[PDB]
Ligand binder design. Structure first.
Ligand code: HEM
Length: 399
């Protein structure tokens, strides 16, 4: 059994194994870092089954849960938030924070999202690139989602830049473990203080809603509110940063489609849909353990065996998406959902917010900067390490 996670085939490409497995052995065994074996599911239909089957569990203290690193094994010891819960606990806690992320709420947020993107683009304009390229990640891709989610949680404007840097340190590939865990403690300590404050004078933010509607009535306590706030911050932020940078790089690689977007900004939604299919930047979140024996394809998965469902592989499934390895914002979409945000009950709570941010970015960026160019040869783009989720570490641009 091959070791898993697989390495990406190159900078922007998925692991090459997935295409072979889809064709010859779609439900197969892989070897995890601790020697244990898990089942790997690669076809769109089977990923959807894994994501919805009531016979499978996300509870991480169940025998066989497929942890992919040693830190995940110890993170499994902590008290769980709703990301690691089964029904009915899952929606009991998820419903406490879902109101901010509904399509209606995200529609109401659109002026603020547009203003945030406009402000940061104008700052980058004023900085200029008269002395060399600027890093689009540091200058724009990182603060756009960070400022938004921090503002939704309740962080005051003056604290945004420091906390944005701390969160980036958490996941930066060149941070030592000491730097990353210090940054992590920094975020937890700040959130605990913000919870104490909003308990005393609530404002109009997510943390205040939790304090008023759940902590004070006693449905959760203040340490749960901290954990839920932290999850909403760290679950999707680095992914958003990567999707923004990957979109710019992808457009630089497909000049004809960038030209269409420049001439019709209203194609931004369709570009975003294809971006989230093609670049599946969170590919290791759909993990389960079997509560009972379960059959998937021609394989029997025994109770207490672990399953990993690759939504990355499913988004390249030739049986669902015609020419899946071509980037084509003008593709015709089949009835089946792309799985960039997962599927079923656990499907990304922030799907609508994430798409609205991405759509705002790509309907605006090239109207503001019509001559935006990646400043290094496209073959020299600094992608994340091949053993990680696809992403871009830095992206020098001129404009
Ligand atoms: C392009 C950006 C993003 C992508 C591609 C993405 C992708 C995903 C995926 C694949 C999952 C697993 C869903 C499943 O188990 O079926 C997920 C879950 C989740 N994501 Fe996102 N995400 C993004 C942005 C965000 C943001 C901005 C936030 C928070 C504000 C967020 C918070 C969460 C949470 C809390 C979950 C757990 C949902 C649950 O188990 O109920 N994500 N996301």
């Amino acid at each position: 059994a091959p070791s898993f996670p697989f390495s990406r085939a190159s900078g922007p490409e998925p692991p090459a194994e997935f295409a072979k497995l889809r064709a010859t052995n779609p439900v197969s065994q892989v070897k995890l870092f601790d020697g244990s074996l898990a089942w790997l599911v690669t076809k769109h239909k089977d990923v959807c089954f894994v994501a919805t089957s009531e016979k499978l569990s996300k509870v991480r203290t169940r025998q066989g849960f497929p942890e992919l690193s040693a830190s995940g094994k110890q993170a499994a010891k902590a008290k769980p938030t709703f990301v690691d819960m089964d029904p009915p606990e899952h929606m009991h806690q998820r419903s406490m924070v879902e109101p901010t992320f509904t399509p209606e709420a995200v529609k109401n947020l659109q002026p603020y999202i547009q203003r945030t993107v406009d402000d940061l683009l104008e700052q980058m304009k004023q900085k200029g690139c008269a002395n060399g390229p600027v890093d689009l990640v540091k200058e724009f891709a990182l603060p756009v989602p960070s400022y938004i989610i921090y503002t939704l949680l309740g962080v005051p404007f003056n604290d945004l830049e420091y906390l944005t840097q701390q969160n980036a340190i958490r996941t930066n590939g060149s941070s030592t473990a000491r730097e990353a865990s210090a940054a992590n403690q920094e975020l937890l300590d700040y959130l605990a203080i913000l919870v104490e404050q909003r308990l005393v004078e609530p404002k109009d933010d997510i943390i205040s809603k939790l304090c008023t509607e759940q902590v004070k009535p006693g449905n959760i306590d203040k340490s749960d509110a901290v954990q839920i706030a932290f999850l909403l911050l760290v679950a999707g932020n680095a992914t958003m940063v990567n999707m923004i940078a990957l979109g710019v790089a992808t457009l630089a690689q497909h000049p004809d489609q960038l030209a269409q977007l420049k001439a019709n900004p209203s194609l931004a939604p369709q570009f975003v849909e294809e971006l989230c299919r093609y670049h599946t930047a969170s590919a290791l979140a759909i993990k389960r353990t079997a509560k009972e024996d379960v059959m998937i394809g021609d394989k029997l998965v025994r109770a207490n065996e672990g399953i990993i469902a690759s939504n990355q592989s499913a988004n390249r499934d030739e049986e669902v998406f015609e020419n899946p390895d071509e980037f084509n914002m003008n593709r015709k979409w089949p009835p089946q959902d792309p799985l960039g945000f997962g599927f079923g009950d656990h499907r990304c709570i922030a799907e609508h917010l994430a798409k609205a941010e991405l759509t705002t970015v790509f309907s605006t960026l090239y109207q503001k900067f019509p001559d935006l160019k990646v400043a290094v040869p496209l073959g020299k783009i600094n992608y994340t390490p091949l053993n990680r989720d696809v992403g871009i570490v830095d992206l020098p641009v001129i404009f």
